Design an enzyme around this catalytic site. Structure first.
Site, PDB file in Angstrom:
ATOM      1  N   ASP A 118      53.010  54.926  30.587  1.00 59.63           N
ATOM      2  CA  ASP A 118      51.610  54.770  30.216  1.00 59.63           C
ATOM      3  C   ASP A 118      51.491  54.694  28.703  1.00 59.63           C
ATOM      4  O   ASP A 118      51.749  55.672  28.000  1.00 59.63           O
ATOM      5  CB  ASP A 118      50.753  55.917  30.756  1.00 59.63           C
ATOM      6  CG  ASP A 118      49.263  55.611  30.702  1.00 59.63           C
ATOM      7  OD1 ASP A 118      48.844  54.774  29.874  1.00 59.63           O
ATOM      8  OD2 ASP A 118      48.508  56.210  31.496  1.00 59.63           O
ATOM      9  N   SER A 169      41.965  58.392  34.253  1.00 55.69           N
ATOM     10  CA  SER A 169      41.681  58.004  32.873  1.00 55.69           C
ATOM     11  C   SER A 169      40.428  58.695  32.344  1.00 55.69           C
ATOM     12  O   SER A 169      40.411  59.915  32.175  1.00 55.69           O
ATOM     13  CB  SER A 169      41.534  56.483  32.770  1.00 55.69           C
ATOM     14  OG  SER A 169      41.939  56.016  31.496  1.00 55.69           O
ATOM     15  N   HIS A 220      49.802  52.723  33.533  1.00 53.11           N
ATOM     16  CA  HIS A 220      48.515  53.411  33.607  1.00 53.11           C
ATOM     17  C   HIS A 220      47.915  53.661  34.999  1.00 53.11           C
ATOM     18  O   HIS A 220      47.809  54.810  35.436  1.00 53.11           O
ATOM     19  CB  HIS A 220      47.494  52.666  32.740  1.00 53.11           C
ATOM     20  CG  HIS A 220      46.283  53.486  32.406  1.00 53.11           C
ATOM     21  ND1 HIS A 220      46.361  54.793  31.970  1.00 53.11           N
ATOM     22  CD2 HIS A 220      44.967  53.180  32.439  1.00 53.11           C
ATOM     23  CE1 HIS A 220      45.142  55.257  31.755  1.00 53.11           C
ATOM     24  NE2 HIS A 220      44.279  54.299  32.031  1.00 53.11           N
TER      25      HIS A 220
END
Length: 308
Positions: free
Chosen positions: A250, A122, A280
């Site tokens: 995601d 991320s 995610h």
């Protein structure tokens, strides 16, 4: 609520290191498979809200498969910046801190003759890919791995959490202001058991991010996505292999961002891997089905870029 994963190796000690006005909590995870053989070391850049334990599940598996792991709680995160310090960091520190630990690990890896790889999830993914373009030692990292990197937010996240758009726009006027927009548990993972742990974890809630921090990691990915004047083709470290894993479901970080990054990447050894049914946090908080799929792919990729 308990942490769902049962670590199979010996958990390293949470060590500490002072650097540039912060006391960094970090972890070196040694190979534990009965052989004195190390194929390489992976440096793990965590994402926003995360900390060492979130990467326990990945580090445990690297250790078993012949790979050492180094991770540190970044400035603004985890044990490194508690209380009012939480959320307080910026573009300068993010990379200046990273250089410090890259150099630490490049030296130790140089000593034992093993390659150093860089991994990010991320926010950490955004940092990882950006380092491949701007890092002092971008040419000395052996390979880059992105885990659903923050390049552009998924439309769904921007629509339901408008805060992450506005707050960066206001960072210039009040950078020290910290804000908590809560965890999108259902977006983060499809596994209910990790959800419960995450929503119950004192080290995870509350999670504050300052306007400065947020603007800076938002600008970080948008820079890659925009690719103004072929920035990526010009600055990506020559002939360095890169792979992104992105959960197909995601809805926090748009998979279309990784897609465009791989497209824009000038390196020969480049790949995007999309995983159906996966959301995610594919490397930490997803199902055993997903993680195993996702980790095997990383394990094999690392074996292809390491010797004996």
């Amino acid at each position: 609520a308990p942490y769902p994963y049962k670590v199979q190796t010996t958990v390293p000690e949470l060590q500490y290191e002072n650097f540039d006005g912060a006391k960094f909590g970090y972890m070196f995870w040694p190979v534990q498979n009965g052989t004195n053989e190390v194929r390489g070391r992976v440096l793990l850049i965590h994402g926003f809200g995360e900390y060492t334990k979130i990467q326990f599940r990945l580090m445990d598996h690297l250790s078993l498969n012949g790979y050492e792991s180094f991770t540190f709680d970044q400035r603004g995160a985890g044990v490194t910046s508690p209380g009012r310090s939480k959320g307080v960091t910026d573009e300068y520190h993010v990379f200046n801190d990273l250089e410090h630990f890259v150099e630490k690990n490049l030296s130790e890896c140089k000593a034992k003759g093993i390659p150093l790889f860089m991994w990010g999830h991320s926010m950490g993914g955004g940092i990882c890919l950006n380092y491949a373009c701007q890092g002092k030692h971008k040419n000395e990292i052996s390979g880059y791995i992105g885990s659903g990197p923050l390049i552009i937010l998924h439309p769904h996240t921007m629509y339901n959490k408008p805060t992450q758009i506005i707050a960066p726009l206001l960072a210039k006027f009040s950078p020290r202001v910290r804000i908590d927009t809560g965890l999108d548990l259902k977006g983060i993972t499809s596994d209910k058991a990790y959800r419960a742990f995450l929503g119950s974890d004192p080290m995870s809630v509350p999670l504050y991010g300052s306007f400065r921090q947020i603007h800076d990691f938002m600008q970080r990915g948008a820079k890659l996505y925009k690719n103004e004047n072929n920035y990526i083709q010009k600055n990506f470290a020559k002939d360095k292999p890169v792979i992104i894993m992105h959960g197909q479901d995601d809805t926090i970080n748009d998979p279309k961002g990784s897609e465009k990054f791989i497209r824009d990447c000038p390196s020969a050894d480049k790949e995007l891997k999309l995983y159906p049914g996966a959301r995610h946090s594919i490397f930490s908080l997803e199902t055993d089905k997903v993680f195993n799929t996702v980790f095997n792919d990383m394990k094999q990729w690392l074996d292809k870029h390491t010797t004996t």
